[PDB]
From a paper:
L1 can interact with cellular receptors, such as heparan sulfate proteoglycans (HSPGs) or laminin-332 on the cell surface to drive primary viral attachment to host cells. The 55∼60-nm diameter HPV capsid is composed of 72 L1 protein pentamers, each consisting of five copies of L1, and an uncertain number of L2 proteins.
The PsV displayed as homogeneous particles in the view of low-dose cryo-EM images. We finally resolved the structure at a resolution of 5.5 Å, as determined by the gold-standard Fourier shell correlation (FSC), with a cutoff threshold of 0.143. Like previous overall structures of HPV particles, the HPV6 capsid displayed a T = 7d icosahedral structure, with a diameter of 58 nm, and the capsomers exhibited a pronounced star-shaped morphology. The pentamer of HPV6 was easily identifiable, and “suspended bridges” (comprising the C-terminal arm of L1 proteins) connecting neighboring pentamers were conspicuous in the density map. In the structure, the HPV6L1 monomer exihibited well-resolved α-helix and β-sheet core regions and interpretable loop regions. Overall, the asymmetric unit of the HPV6 model had a very similar core region to that of HPV16, with a root mean square deviation [RMSD] of 1.95 Å for all C-α atoms of L1.
Author numbering:
A (entry chain E): 26 to 468
B (entry chain D): 24 to 468
C (entry chain F): 201 to 290
Write the structure that this text describes.
């Protein structure tokens, strides 16, 4: 039903800032000096693009400027990523830990504060997600216990699966679960320090496969490998005693209980250069969903998260410039670099205009009708109803801080990294490389 | 399969979600009942699919088929496992293990027993599999205790073994490769294996036994992937039992007149995940099956078994019964659960049958107990036939117990238990606005 | 380890091996070469690299900036001492 056009463009930025501290965000209450800039953080970008009915087109002899609209059609998609390779690492300098359970006979008596410096690697991961609708991240928090008996602190609760949109800055889980280590962990010491202040996420694809619009997902790959290195313990008491059915009470020191909690050790394998999905161009020559290149609002969502170039930088600075070697010479400083760019090739679609397909987009999305004009008057939404909002000689209806004002813009508290490229088009494409790579593909 | 006609009717089904969490190692409960059962990654996954009768739905045309002759049924086309968790393995062990010491890097030799039980946690082997069929599958493990019995038994003899072909119930742990055998029976130490394996039974499927009956009620799809490597080596602690023959060894004096370890124990291990090596969310298409059964839910009913190790993570959270204090090791008490996620995405084809005598003979061959659900099976001579003379011997207070013949066999497996799912309700004609029903067009072309 | 003038950024001259103590490592990009519309610096390229992590090590000296007092739970007595969160990949 769409009108496939004839002319293709391209835009790209030149660079994208991401440099600074991997471990955490040091920020004064007056001002921020550097955010937590880490490789493991989710990297979501949104470009803003212009509108093709806004940009005047001189070769418009195909279509009449009243009976038709115009929308872009994203065709060629390409991820720019150009840093040197290398693994990063984090940890916790104070970890609840008895010993290696693998080669040890029994454990000592838990006294006070066996929290020591252990610093651990993470997994391989590379991914991509492209659309004109934001993606959903699925995480958990503690389920509220139901009021049958009063609970004491120190309990196992159940757990609610929480759907949320994905921000920037939050990190991916490393097989430790999309769970609130803010809420569920309560000691601030059991998981590493990079994540202990927050929670981690993961995208659920099957509910993401459950949309009729197609505008949220049409193209997606993944790699993500991992193995487990070691087996250690926690340090503390156990809220659940293991039963005496399948165990035997011993004698002597064996009557003193050993560790029941075991912890794993997530760990990365060898890296690969060849297996990277970066800088291989992709095209929706055919769609898998309901978005046949029809991105809306001149808006794009991209999220690509990587662990491969994750190396964090070491740098020191002298304090006294001493001659004979001391330990009081150099104060430490830790940063970590990231660098990306985005490269995209497009098409157009001139929309045939009736009220039926004007009723189509409302059945897809009602928000962008605010600028999709057609004549603003005859969407006749009005039908018969009693009254909710429009009878105000007030007397029962009141002071109302919340009810209708915080809801209509959903993404304002969604804090994520942004990109503004509303002028970077290109008519001819022999002067741009990846379109020339397309030019042999088109022939 | 050449007696039915492949129709043109194709629908879609969908289960939305299946939330399931629980403690990994054992089940927590009071004395009464379980609200929080033992859930972990390595339990076998027995399920039941339930489909409604196709004749009771108003199919769009009534002329191409005839209900007075035949009673059509669903037929399967292509299904897949929609696994949905972040990838990761969670491990366990047993806090009191039977062991001398390590044999690999033998620093010094041991002397047996004296109760030095060992806390060692280790990983497992890896599996991935999928298995379907209109009848639930049959697994195996080993048994103990019976012989031809000519000789008496002393304290602690050697028993022979016995293979137990048995059904898989859900919650049964899949083995780490040790042995499909009753650990409650053969492992009397109650200490030697990890904690969820100490009392229960691990089992395993026999695929050639699935290849035995040539119908195919237990198999028409069969895909697999497993990997394996063992890291280091152990002993046990105890007594030798059967001694090694010294007829080829040469003994020695000093401390070496004493016996060393003869019992030698592996420590198996797992390799990394390979996310391209999985088999989930890839649409599977079989135009030609492997048994006589070309994908028919005989019973309007199916059985799927798929066990994961990739998303086998354990999960922790810390909690202090204390309000706040200066930090000791006596502050927090710990709790463990284990997340799970499974969903099913289901495409079928309505298939017509025809009624003939050898047809209704063959249903009595296949499962004779099922035609009573069908309606056009009527016996014109009576089966009750007034042998009891239609219940009038005298009924001398028979009324109280007259109803004790109610009805028998309403379930073939009453004591068998497993988790399942209702699917009487999730159907639609045009699957195109559903996911993967557009991928129906790809394979068809 | 990084694309830097290391002897500038490290005044210790002892936190890296020898051939990077007073030198400066570089690494070729692709994209600026991809950006040029002439290609006198690019017409055919390829690469292959493998790496994994052996160990984790530390550095000793003046401490850095710790967390803002809440993600730490303060140790007791001997455990009051806090050290190198400098996490050395290998």
């Amino acid at each position: 039903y769409v009108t496939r056009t004839n002319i293709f463009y391209h835009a790209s930025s030149s660079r994208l800032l991401a440099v600074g501290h991997p471990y955490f965000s040091i920020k004064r209450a007056n001002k921020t000096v550097v955010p937590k800039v880490s490789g493991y953080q989710y990297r979501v970008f949104k470009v803003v693009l212009p509108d093709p009915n806004k940009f005047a087109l001189p070769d418009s002899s195909l279509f009449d400027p009243t009976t038709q609209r115009l929308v872009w059609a994203c065709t060629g998609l390409e991820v720019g990523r150009g840093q040197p390779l290398g693994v990063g690492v984090s940890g916790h300098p104070f970890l609840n830990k008895y010993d290696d359970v693998e080669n040890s006979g029994s454990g000592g008596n838990p006294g006070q504060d066996n929290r020591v410096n252990v610093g651990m690697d993470y997994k391989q991961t590379q991914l991509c997600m492209v659309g004109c609708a934001p993606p959903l991240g699925e995480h958990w928090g503690k389920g509220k216990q139901c009021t049958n008996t009063p609970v004491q602190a120190g309990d196992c609760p159940p757990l609610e699966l929480i759907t949320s949109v994905i921000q920037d800055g939050d990190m991916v889980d490393t097989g430790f679960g999309a769970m609130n280590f803010a809420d569920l962990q309560t000691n601030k010491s059991d998981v590493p320090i990079d994540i202990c202040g927050t929670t981690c996420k993961y995208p659920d694809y099957l509910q993401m496969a459950a949309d009729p619009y197609g505008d949220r997902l049409f193209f997606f790959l993944r790699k993500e490998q991992m193995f487990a290195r070691h087996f250690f313990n926690r340090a503390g008491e156990v809220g659940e005693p293991v039963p005496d059915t399948l165990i035997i009470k011993g004698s002597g020191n064996r009557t003193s209980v050993g560790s029941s909690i075991y912890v794993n050790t997530p760990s990365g394998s060898l890296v690969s250069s060849e297996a990277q999905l970066f800088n291989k161009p992709y095209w929706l020559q055919k769609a898998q969903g309901h978005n046949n290149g029809i991105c809306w609002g001149n808006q794009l969502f991209v999220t690509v998260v990587d662990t491969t170039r994750s190396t964090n930088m070491t740098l020191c600075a002298s304090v006294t410039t001493s001659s004979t070697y001391t330990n009081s010479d150099y104060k430490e400083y830790m940063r970590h670099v990231e660098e990306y760019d985005l490269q995209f090739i497009f098409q157009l679609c001139s929309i045939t205009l009736s009220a039926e397909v004007m009723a189509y987009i409302h059945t897809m999305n009602p928000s962008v009708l605010e600028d999709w004009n057609f004549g603003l008057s005859p969407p006749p939404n009005g039908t018969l109803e009693d009254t909710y909002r429009y009878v105000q000689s007030q007397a029962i209806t009141c002071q109302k801080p919340t009810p209708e004002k915080e809801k209509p813009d959903p993404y304002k508290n969604l804090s994520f990294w942004e990109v503004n490229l509303k002028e970077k088009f290109s008519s001819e494409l022999d002067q741009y490389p990846l379109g020339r790579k397309f030019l042999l593909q088109s022939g």
